[PDB]
Structures are given as structure tokens and as C-alpha cells.
């Protein structure tokens, strides 16, 4: 059929946007009948429309790189592109040098 | 516009109720020359200028 | 008269997707596999498979592999038939390295 309204209603009902719902292609005649939001809540509950869980953005290489920066690595001059008073300003270091002594 | 006075909306009500074709039964009526509606104002063609 | 033959192949895509623009290679892989199955089985209605479609597009437009193992089945058509009573149906098969394999007639039992 023409399932534009069903995908829009399913995105509004489940709450996840239109790019992640899964109107299954086998039961399409059934989804041609479900025209209201109360019928979308039936077709989500039994498993005819599901949620299609989130694509993984692994912050794991990030953790390995930050762990290596904690170890002292990855901080030469060819990983250092801002000035010395822009990476960490001298006024910050001075406040730390003098809120401690005072 | 999206937040209106009343007078402009009143004229939109008239501009809605005029935006329709002929009744189908007038074309059978005796001594008729009116074959269509020569005042169909669309929104993509003619702005009504309020 | 029966002609329900199912075979397997290696298609060499490097000698067919050579020198093509990069944003056209994988659709030309598709249009080329249809021409391949037209060449071999002889029918002119070729259906691919979405498994085979994924197997071409594993690496975007410009990363189609060099050799592929196809499995072409020349099935007979029915049900308000098209202009030929037979059609090809082209699946992939899973192999580790597609280099080295000849053509094989698949027995159906």
C-alpha cells in the first residue's frame, strides 16, 4: 500500500524518529489497516513495528587515546598546534601558583 | 500572520468559502452561459493581497 | 526443454569495472552481473539477490571486489509469464578467498 502515515504515526508513538522504525514488509496488509495511533500502539506491542536500536558510536578508541595521553604519550611538537599560552594560559597557572601559596 | 487580527481572518473565511468549483446542477439550467468558475483564486498563483 | 540448470562461477570484475568513474562502479557491477547471467544462461530476465547486492556494496561505490563467486540458477517462470518462460536468479556463495575456484555444476538432490 502507501505507508507514509503509518511510519509517521509510528515515529510519533514510539518516540524515536522516522529513520528508526521497522514496519515489517511481510505484514504490510495488516499495516494498511492500522490508520490510527491506537492501532499503532497495538502493532508496536505485539512486535509488528519495532524500534531499530541506535547505531553504535563507540567512544573506545577515544578512551585508549586519552589513556595514552594520561601516560605521557601523543604530546610532541607535531601533536601541539596551539601556542603555549593558548593550550593552558599563563594566568591560569599563575592563579594555581598563588591560590596555593596564599 | 500565524498571529492575526480578526478582520484579516474574516476575509480568509470568505476566501475559503469562495474557493470552490461550480455546483454541478447549474450546467443543466435554462439559458446558461456559465461553464466554469472564472474566479478560482489559488495560493500558488494569485496572492489575494488581503 | 527442462533447463533447470544451476551452476556456480567466478566473475572477474576487475576486467570489467576497469577504468570506470568511481561513483559508477558498483551500479556497473550490477549491470555487468546481469549481462554475465544473460551471456551464460541465455535468458534475458535476470533477478539478482539482496544478499548479492550487499556483497557488491560492502565497500561503497568504488571498492567492489576483484573476483566473486556467483551461483546462477536458471529457473522456469510461471504465473502470468513474461516474454521468456525461464529466468535467472543469481545468489552469492560464502567462500574465504574467491581466487582459484573453477566453475561447478551444482547437483540438486
Amino acid at each position: 500500500a502507501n505507508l507514509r502515515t503509518q511510519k509517521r504515526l509510528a515515529a510519533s508513538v514510539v518516540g524515536v524518529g522516522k529513520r528508526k522504525v521497522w514496519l515489517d514488509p511481510n505484514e504490510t496488509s495488516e499495516i494498511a489497516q492500522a490508520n490510527s495511533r491506537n492501532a499503532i500502539r497495538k502493532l508496536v506491542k505485539n512486535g509488528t513495528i519495532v524500534k531499530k536500536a541506535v547505531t553504535v558510536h563507540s567512544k573506545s578508541r577515544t578512551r585508549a587515546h586519552a589513556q595514552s595521553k594520561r601516560e605521557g604519550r601523543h604530546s610532541g611538537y607535531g601533536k601541539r598546534k596551539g601556542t603555549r599560552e593558548a593550550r593552558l594560559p599563563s594566568q591560569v597557572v599563575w592563579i594555581r601558583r598563588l591560590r596555593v601559596l596564599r | 500572520a500565524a498571529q492575526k487580527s480578526f478582520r484579516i481572518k474574516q476575509k480568509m473565511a470568505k476566501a475559503k468559502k469562495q474557493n470552490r468549483p461550480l455546483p454541478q446542477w447549474i450546467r443543466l439550467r435554462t439559458n446558461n452561459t456559465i461553464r466554469y468558475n472564472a474566479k478560482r483564486r489559488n495560493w500558488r498563483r494569485t496572492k489575494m493581497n488581503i | 526443454l527442462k533447463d533447470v540448470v544451476t551452476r556456480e562461477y567466478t566473475i572477474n570484475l576487475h576486467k570489467r569495472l576497469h577504468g570506470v568513474s568511481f561513483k559508477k562502479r558498483a551500479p556497473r557491477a550490477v549491470k555487468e552481473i546481469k549481462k554475465f547471467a544473460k551471456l551464460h544462461m541465455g535468458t534475458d530476465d535476470v533477478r539478482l539477490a539482496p544478499e548479492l547486492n550487499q556483497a557488491i556494496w560492502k565497500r561503497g561505490v568504488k571498492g567492489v571486489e576483484y573476483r566473486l563467486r556467483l551461483r546462477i540458477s536458471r529457473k522456469r517462470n510461471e504465473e502470468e509469464d513474461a516474454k521468456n518462460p525461464l529466468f535467472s536468479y543469481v545468489e552469492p556463495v560464502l567462500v574465504a578467498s574467491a581466487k582459484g575456484l573453477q566453475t561447478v555444476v551444482v547437483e540438486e538432490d
Binding site: - | 478582520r7 484579516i8 493581497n49 488581503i50 | -
Partner: protein
């Protein structure tokens, strides 16, 4: 720059509907209509606008009262009612 990218910037109104003549010629900053002249107590028409008088004179509207005046002259401005004669 003086053409289509300065017809982009053109999204206000200098005129609104006149209450008197209803024609949308009511200038907002001057607070006076430019077609009929509202709220001046007269209606602006000029003798160089030969067509403008042809658009705004009597008989172009309903004639909600004058339509009945000449007829009411023909009978001599009668008052009261008529009687019943026969049949």
C-alpha cells in the same frame, strides 16, 4: 543588487485595509487612506481621475435606499395603506 536580491527584503506592508472603502490603500505611518482619503470627512476624487469616478460613483454598489426613492416619487410619497376591492 538593486534588483532581485533587494526584492528579497520586501516583506512588510505600507498599506492595510481601509475601513471606509475596503480597498487596501490605508497608509499606516501617515494614518490616512490614499484612495478614498479616510479619515478626512470627504471622499477624495479628482477631475483628472475620470475613471476613478467611474469606479466609485453611485449605482456601482447596492443602492440600498436610492433604488426605492424614484419609485416612491412616482406615487407622490404615499403614506398609510391601500384597501381591499374585490376578488
Amino acid at each position: 543588487g538593486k534588483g532581485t536580491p533587494s526584492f528579497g527584503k520586501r516583506h512588510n506592508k505600507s498599506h492595510t485595509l481601509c475601513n471606509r472603502c475596503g480597498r487596501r490603500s490605508f497608509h499606516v505611518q501617515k494614518k490616512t487612506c490614499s484612495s478614498c482619503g479616510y479619515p478626512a470627512a470627504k471622499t477624495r476624487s479628482y477631475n483628472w481621475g475620470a475613471k476613478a469616478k467611474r469606479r466609485h460613483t453611485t449605482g456601482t454598489g447596492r443602492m440600498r435606499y436610492l433604488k426605492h426613492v424614484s419609485r416612491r416619487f412616482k406615487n407622490g410619497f404615499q403614506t398609510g395603506s391601500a384597501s381591499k376591492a374585490s376578488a
